[PDB]
């Protein structure tokens, strides 16, 4: 709830926040996603990320979800996302970190 | 609070730290990145009065700014943008760091009693 009321603060970022679990579900996406892709936060959370991703770039994202190329792994990669404003090329920058599962915490920035 | 905690580091991209202060002037939240500007740890600061972090000369102004009507006793939001000196424990300082608070005043639900107003802001060094 604090996160929901404080969401607007992430407008200072040059991109949107994306958190994706190992099962490839979007655990979280900042509302600012609407400003880049035109999707609403609510349309995207609890759904698969692959619906947002170009079919050719899906394998790469899936790869990024993997530990092999507590603690964390740095992640920095390119990926095209569905953009209703047909696609928008973005750089994902973040970390892979954690019975509990593994998760990608990232910022997606337009090129 | 745990996933938020796990995602904290992403706020390192910001030019400042996130501060959330309730109407009673308590720090509800501060991003870990506060340590990079003021030298305080997040856990030491949360649940304490902001006035402990504020220069005594800037306290009245903070209080006024914390009140929705600017009266403590055409935008689409209750925006706040103001100057404030904060206690800074870092070596390149005389104890204080001049910062700009920029954010919005909104009701904070979830606590506990009726929701209170809170300043959600980013504090940026000048």
From Swiss-Prot, chain A:
Q: How the protein is affected by changing residue 8 to D?
A: Highly disrupts the dimerization ability of AHR. Reduces the AHR transcription factor activity induction by 50%
- Where do the PAS domain residues begin and end? 9-69
Q: What is the effect of changing residue 5 to A?
A: Reduces transcription activity. Decreases interaction with ARNT
What is this protein for, i.e. what is its function? Ligand-activated transcription factor that enables cells to adapt to changing conditions by sensing compounds from the environment, diet, microbiome and cellular metabolism, and which plays important roles in development, immunity and cancer. Upon ligand binding, translocates into the nucleus, where it heterodimerizes with ARNT and induces transcription by binding to xenobiotic response elements (XRE). Regulates a variety of biological processes, including angiogenesis, hematopoiesis, drug and lipid metabolism, cell motility and immune modulation.
Q: What is the effect of changing residue 97 to D?
A: Significantly reduces binding affinities of the AHR:ARNT heterodimer to DRE
Listed under subunit, the entry gives: Homodimer. Heterodimer; efficient DNA binding requires dimerization with another bHLH protein. Interacts with ARNT; the heterodimer ARNT:AHR binds to core DNA sequence 5'-TGCGTG-3' within the dioxin response element (DRE) of target gene promoters and activates their transcription. Binds MYBBP1A. Interacts with coactivators including SRC-1, RIP140 and NOCA7, and with the corepressor SMRT. Interacts with NEDD8 and IVNS1ABP. Interacts with BMAL1. Interacts with HSP90AB1. Interacts with TIPARP; leading to mono-ADP-ribosylation of AHR and subsequent inhibition of AHR.
What is this protein's tissue specificity according to the annotation? Expressed in all tissues tested including brain, heart, kidney, liver, lung, muscle, ovary, skin, spleen and thymus.
| Residue numbers spanned by region Required for maintaining the overall integrity of the AHR:ARNT heterodimer and its transcriptional activity | 9-17, 105-107
Q: What induces it?
A: Induced or repressed by TGF-beta and dioxin in a cell-type specific fashion. Repressed by cAMP, retinoic acid, and TPA.
Q: Tell me where it resides.
A: Cytoplasm; Nucleus
Provide the record's note on post-translational modification.
Answer: Mono-ADP-ribosylated, leading to inhibit transcription activator activity of AHR.
Q: What is the effect of changing residue 12 to D?
A: Highly disrupts the dimerization ability of AHR. Reduces transcription activity. Impairs interaction with ARNT
Result, substituting residue 45 to D: Completely abolished the AHR induction activity, the ligand-induced nuclear translocation of AHR, and drastically reduced DRE-binding in vitro
Q: In a knockout, what does one observe?
A: AHR knockdown in the retina results in reduced electroretinogram responses, thinning of the outer segment, and degeneration of photoreceptors.
A further note on this protein reads: Although it interacts with NEDD8, it does not seem to be neddylated.
Q: Which residues of the full protein are shown?
A: 110 to 266 of 848
What does the comment on domains in this protein's record state? The PAS 1 domain is essential for dimerization and also required for AHR:ARNT heterodimerization.
Q: What is this protein's record name?
A: Aryl hydrocarbon receptor
Question: What gene, per UniProt, encodes this protein?
Answer: Ahr
Swiss-Prot record, chain B:
Name the domain of life this protein comes from.
Eukaryota
Quote the tissue specificity entry: Expressed in all tissues tested including brain, heart, kidney, liver, lung, muscle, ovary, skin, spleen and thymus.
On induction, the UniProt comment says:
Induced or repressed by TGF-beta and dioxin in a cell-type specific fashion. Repressed by cAMP, retinoic acid, and TPA.
Q: Where is this region: Required for maintaining the overall integrity of the AHR:ARNT heterodimer and its transcriptional activity?
A: 10-18, 120-122
What does the record note as the disruption phenotype of the gene behind this chain?
Answer: AHR knockdown in the retina results in reduced electroretinogram responses, thinning of the outer segment, and degeneration of photoreceptors.
Ranges of residues in domain PAS: 10-73
Reported effect, residue 10 to E = Highly disrupts the dimerization ability of AHR. Reduces transcription activity. Decreases interaction with ARNT
Location of the protein in the cell: Cytoplasm; Nucleus
Q: How is the protein altered post-translationally, as described in the entry?
A: Mono-ADP-ribosylated, leading to inhibit transcription activator activity of AHR.
Quaternary structure, from the entry = Homodimer. Heterodimer; efficient DNA binding requires dimerization with another bHLH protein. Interacts with ARNT; the heterodimer ARNT:AHR binds to core DNA sequence 5'-TGCGTG-3' within the dioxin response element (DRE) of target gene promoters and activates their transcription. Binds MYBBP1A. Interacts with coactivators including SRC-1, RIP140 and NOCA7, and with the corepressor SMRT. Interacts with NEDD8 and IVNS1ABP. Interacts with BMAL1. Interacts with HSP90AB1. Interacts with TIPARP; leading to mono-ADP-ribosylation of AHR and subsequent inhibition of AHR.
Q: What is known about what this protein does?
A: Ligand-activated transcription factor that enables cells to adapt to changing conditions by sensing compounds from the environment, diet, microbiome and cellular metabolism, and which plays important roles in development, immunity and cancer. Upon ligand binding, translocates into the nucleus, where it heterodimerizes with ARNT and induces transcription by binding to xenobiotic response elements (XRE). Regulates a variety of biological processes, including angiogenesis, hematopoiesis, drug and lipid metabolism, cell motility and immune modulation.
Q: What is the additional note?
A: Although it interacts with NEDD8, it does not seem to be neddylated.
* Domain topic, free-text comment: The PAS 1 domain is essential for dimerization and also required for AHR:ARNT heterodimerization.
Name the record gives this protein = Aryl hydrocarbon receptor
Source organism of this protein record:
Mus musculus
Q: Which residues of the full protein are shown?
A: 110 to 266 of 848
């Amino acid at each position: 709830s604090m996160l929901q009321e404080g969401e607007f603060l992430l407008q200072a970022l040059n991109g949107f926040v994306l958190v994706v679990t190992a099962d490839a579900l979007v655990f979280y996406a900042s509302s600012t996603i609407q400003d880049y892709l035109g999707f609403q936060q609510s349309d995207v959370i609890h759904q698969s990320v692959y619906e947002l991703i170009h079919t050719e770039d899906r394998a790469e994202f899936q790869r990024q979800l993997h530990w092999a190329l507590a603690s964390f792994m740095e992640r920095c990669f390119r990926c095209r996302l569905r953009c209703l404003l047909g696609f928008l090329a973005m750089n994902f920058q973040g970390r892979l970190k954690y019975p509990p599962q593994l998760a990608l915490f990232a910022i997606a920035t337009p090129l």
